[PDB]
Amino acid sequence: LGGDLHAQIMRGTRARPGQQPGSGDIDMEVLLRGVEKLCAVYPLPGALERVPVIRQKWQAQSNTLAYYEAKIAEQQEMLDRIAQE
Amino acid sequence: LAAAEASLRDEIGPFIQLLLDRAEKHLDRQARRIETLKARAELNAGRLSQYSGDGH
């Protein structure tokens, strides 16, 4: 079983299951693509609906995670500035 | 395709539970990433404050 593209994105998923302790979204990008393919052909309403809704939440949260990562980088830059001074 | 995917994918109903588990684990993974991001942010704040106190 398992879809072809589902198997491809799953291959990448199993290739990077938990090698990301802290980051905005890197492997989660291919997971976003996976849920896109899924919802394009996913069944079971009610249980389904929350998956694309939360997918949109994940997209907005991806932008927010990019903001968090960039702001943490800014904090690190300010720290390096104070340390240098 | 309406009735076709309905009957087919409903029979696929056991498979989709794993897909739900995938999405749930993705959420938990980014949640732990958010925890690490918070750790980094607080680390930068505390370390910058310590460096300021050392040089002030």
Interface probe, candidates A1, A6, A14, A79, chain B, greatest B C-beta count within 10 A:
A79
CB A24 within 8 A of CB A48: no
Experimental method for this entry? cryo-EM
Resolution in A: 4.5
Q: What does the block give as tokens for B44?
A: 């930068």
Task: Give the distance, in angstroms, between the CA of residue A11 and the centroid of all CA atoms in the same chain.
Answer: 16
Closest-CA residue of chain B to A81 = B48
C-alpha to C-alpha distances, B20 to A46, A64, B31, nearest whole angstrom: 12, 23, 17
Q: Does A45 touch chain B (CB under 8 A)?
A: no
In residues, how long is chain A?
Answer: 85
CB A70 within 8 A of CB A23: no
B30/A78 CB distance under 8 A: no
| SS3 sequence of A8-50 | HHHHHHHHCCCCCCCCCCCHHHHHHHHHHHHHHHCCCCCCCCH
A22/B47 CB distance under 8 A: no
Separation of alpha carbons A16 and A13, rounded Å? 5
Separation of alpha carbons A12 and A59, rounded Å? 19
Separation of alpha carbons A56 and A69, rounded Å? 19
| SS3 sequence of B2-44 | HHHHHHHHHHCCCHHHHHHHHHHHHHHHHHHHHHHHHHHHHHH
Q: Does B41 touch chain A (CB under 8 A)?
A: yes
Per DSSP, the three-state class of A1 is: coil
CB A34 within 8 A of CB A6: yes
A25 φ, ψ (degrees, to nearest 5): -160, 110
DSSP state of B55: T
CB A38 within 8 A of CB B19: yes
